[PDB]
Structure 1
Amino acid sequence: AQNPNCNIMIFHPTKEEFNDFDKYIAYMESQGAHRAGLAKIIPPKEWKARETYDNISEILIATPLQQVASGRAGVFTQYHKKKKAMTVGEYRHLANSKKYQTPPHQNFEDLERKYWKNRIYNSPIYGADISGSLFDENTKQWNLGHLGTIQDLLEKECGVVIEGVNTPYLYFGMWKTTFAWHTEDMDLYSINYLHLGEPKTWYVVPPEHGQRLERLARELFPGSSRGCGAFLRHKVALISPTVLKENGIPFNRITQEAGEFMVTFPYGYHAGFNHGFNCAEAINFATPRWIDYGKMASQCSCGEARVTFSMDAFVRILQPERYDLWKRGQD
């Protein structure tokens, strides 16, 4: 078995190896990368996502989210308060303000210590989930707006033709902006490219150990657990590395820097935070190996997680028993 200790693997494809996305994913899995839940891909030195970022300030963040925390430093939830629209130029200036900027620090480890010590006492503003792409249309390799669609994968593997589309999303972050513990919708893959700015630290639980994270989460968030059988789908819960270590949960951590890709694998729980002003682009995708994870994915039926038009069809085809009760949550 390759990668038996489920370590995060880092890949350095050549420009020749960067031509065939699907084949490269299958390569990485042949080396055991999926066992970690997360992998890093450093693009060939010749590759670029676009020529410059000089003209992005006029993108609109229509609903910036203020991430308000409750709990204790190592075990907290966050609620997203909607703010007034602002441009990316306005958001960058805010991120750089004395109130919101990254503190002085020695290295990524000291900054990580400061994040876990101090996150709950601040409410950073996250520009999340903005439909769009920053890849130049002439970028042919690993262009997250040109990937094969999940609906076409389901058709190729299973023969069934379904409605829905699959498009990327932009994330504009600042110091302390946080992504809660989650797997992807329908336990899909994700791919995430850090276009610019400061790093993003990731934490991940190997897929084979995901249920250990879930059991700890039910103990740490007991009222949420009683309310919903898949409450991590709400994407509000945070648990620190120290707490995970105290409870014996297997995990790994890695920091992504600008110019690098991360891939999350089916049923790889992940969480993390941004070090400062940055912009990431991410999209879900599928492979043949995903299908069985999609059939088994948990779902929120309390109604809080409230998810996409395209997820309807996935549920309808892969989980026809759940269909009914799940669309009651989504209607």
Structure 2
Amino acid sequence: SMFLPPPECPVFEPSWEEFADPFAFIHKIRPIAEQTGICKVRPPPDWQPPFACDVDKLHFTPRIQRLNELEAQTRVARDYTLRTFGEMADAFKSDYFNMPVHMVPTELVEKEFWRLVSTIEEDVTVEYGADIASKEFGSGFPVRDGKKLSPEEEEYLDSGWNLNNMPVMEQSVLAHITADICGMKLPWLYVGMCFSSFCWHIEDHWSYSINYLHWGEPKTWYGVPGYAAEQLENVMKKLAPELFVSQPDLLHQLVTIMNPNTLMTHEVPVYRTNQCAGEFVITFPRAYHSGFNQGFNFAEAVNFCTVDWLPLGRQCVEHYRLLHRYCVFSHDEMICKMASKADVLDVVVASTVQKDMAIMIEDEKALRETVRKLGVIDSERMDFELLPDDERQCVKCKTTCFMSAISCSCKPGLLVCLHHVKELCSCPPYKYKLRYRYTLDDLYPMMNALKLRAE
């Protein structure tokens, strides 16, 4: 009547044989879970990593949250310990419902959350912990050096599902990246309380994300499959246009809370789940998700990218360009980095990188033919990867340049990508200089190495 819960997302219970490699399993369930955007993974019953940290020595600065639907939100009172936050959180929920925290039905909290964010008369604010591990504060999973060690203990250190490991693993193409992308490579830690929420969003570069709830009360999720992404965006733009006025920066991205029933009304497929302690939630590329916490809990999450994602990664950078959105990293620079490490790549990875590189080269060849016909004649090799990101973003579309860019001595330090040659200045194109990383004759042997590796 007021809230009709979306259908449940897929729940997977793999045997230990299937649970062996995360990426093999993710590839296995992909045809199913990609249709819902999110899926839940219950590990085999005896897979129980030890959570152990001092509640008094762990301290963090909490972010404050107003609970209002369609109200804009962004990033950066009090400094909590994990204990003092927990005492505040437990007290809040206890007072809100006048009940012991574990007698409050999940269905009630869900219904109450959506009633709360709708009503203007209700001005409930909550606090949330959201930060990258930094030994301040460190990961909830076990990490190396300290304690010799036992078989079970040491297993959780090397496990694929240890979220400290999955970034630097072999099929996460993000691991080969040498540029600083700390926000996209290191696990995030979320300390939640009742009604603390995360707004509708997709990951940077449309990456996967995997989320683990270490302990505490459930985390309620809502998910939308990647194919219905622009459906959702169209729906939201008509209801809250102020969120789509393009941001000055990545730190100024606008997001919001929105009732899934509103989405379902406009025929956007939405799915839900209650993630309990010791369970994984996996989000797929361009899959919109949001949710809230049922109570005091502790979650850990990290982004990652499979070889399945490479074409989508390229598509995303193109999409960013049309939106004039900033990139976290250069997609092309990543490809060329892997190509240069062809002899030590996995052979299926090398096969997939070759395919994306083939597209990159052909697109680059066409672009350079176009700018040559515009009158750009002078050219000079340039090692784009040496420049800081802010020193190699296109003046027009803000894309991070790597393969090529146009410069002119009129405006030192400034660059445009080959799509925006007419956007640099008023000088004639013969005054311009084409700055390139590789000649086409350099690129084909690079791709050829990948071909040999893939045998």
Q: Work out whether the TM-score is over 0.5.
A: yes
SS at match of 1:326: coil
Selected match of 1:76 from 71, 81, 91: 71
Structure 2 unaligned segments of length 5 or more: list them. Answer: 1-6, 144-153, 336-359, 368-391, 401-455
Q: By how many angstroms is 1:291 displaced?
A: 1.2
Q: By how many angstroms is 1:163 displaced?
A: 2.3
Higher mean alpha-carbon deviation, 7-16 vs 160-169, is at: 160-169
Mark the CA change 1:153 to 1:279 in structure 2 (over 3 Å): closer, same or farther.
closer
Counterpart residue number, 1:46: 46
Q: By how many angstroms is 1:241 displaced?
A: 2.0
Q: Summarize deviations over 1:1-20 as a string: whole Å, max 9, x none.
A: xxxxx972111122232221
Contact persistence 1:94–1:100 (CA under 8 A): no
Selected match of 1:123 from 122, 125, 129: 125
Mark the CA change 1:57 to 1:19 in structure 2 (over 3 Å): closer, same or farther.
farther
Q: Summarize deviations over 1:27-70 as a string: whole Å, max 9, x none.
A: 111x52222111100011111121x4463442221x31001244
Q: By how many angstroms is 1:323 displaced?
A: 4.5
Contact persistence 2:200–2:257 (CA under 8 A): yes
SS at match of 1:32: helix
Mark the CA change 1:12 to 1:99 in structure 2 (over 3 Å): closer, same or farther.
closer
Q: By how many angstroms is 1:152 displaced?
A: 6.7
Mark the CA change 1:37 to 1:235 in structure 2 (over 3 Å): closer, same or farther.
farther
Q: By how many angstroms is 1:90 displaced?
A: 1.8
User: Normalising by structure 2, what TM-score?
Assistant: 0.60
Counterpart residue number, 2:191: 172
Amino acid at match of 2:37: G
Matched, 1:114 2:112: yes
CA distance in 2, matches of 1:88, 1:162: 34
Q: By how many angstroms is 1:194 displaced?
A: 0.3
Q: By how many angstroms is 1:85 displaced?
A: 2.4
> Identity across aligned pairs (percent)?
31
Structure 1 unaligned segments of length 5 or more: list them. Answer: 1-5
Selected match of 1:135 from 130, 138, 141: 141
* Higher radius of gyration, 1 or 2: 2
Correspondence 1:1-331 to 2 at 5 A: 8-29=9-30, 31-50=31-50, 52-53=51-52, 55-61=54-60, 63-70=61-68, 74-78=69-73, 83-98=77-92, 103=97, 104=99, 107-119=105-117, 121-131=123-133, 132-137=138-143, 138=154, 139=156, 140-141=158-159, 142-149=161-168, 153-154=172-173, 162-164=178-180, 166-228=185-247, 234=253, 236-297=255-316, 298-299=319-320, 311-314=328-331, 323-324=393-394, 325-326=397-398
Higher strand share: 1
Structure number with the bigger relative contact order (C-alpha 8 A, sep ≥ 6) is: 1
User: Normalising by structure 1, what TM-score?
Assistant: 0.81
Mark the CA change 1:122 to 1:265 in structure 2 (over 3 Å): closer, same or farther.
same
CA-atom RMSD, angstroms? 3.5
Contact persistence 2:67–2:116 (CA under 8 A): no
Between the two proteins, the alignment pairs up a number of residues equal to 309
CA distance in 2, matches of 1:280, 1:155: 22
Q: By how many angstroms is 1:107 displaced?
A: 2.5
CA distance in 2, matches of 1:295, 1:230: 21
Amino acid at match of 1:129: D
Q: By how many angstroms is 1:184 displaced?
A: 0.6
CA distance in 1, matches of 2:171, 2:62: 32
SS at match of 2:302: strand
Amino acid at match of 1:75: L
Amino acid at match of 1:267: R
Q: Summarize deviations over 1:196-253 as a string: whole Å, max 9, x none.
A: 101111111111111110001111111232345999x825211102222332221111
CA distance in 2, matches of 1:23, 1:263: 14
Mark the CA change 1:42 to 1:66 in structure 2 (over 3 Å): closer, same or farther.
same
Amino acid at match of 1:312: F
CA distance in 2, matches of 1:252, 1:54: 34
Q: Summarize deviations over 1:232-290 as a string: whole Å, max 9, x none.
A: x8252111022223322211111101110000000100000001100000000110111
Mark the CA change 1:175 to 1:194 in structure 2 (over 3 Å): closer, same or farther.
same
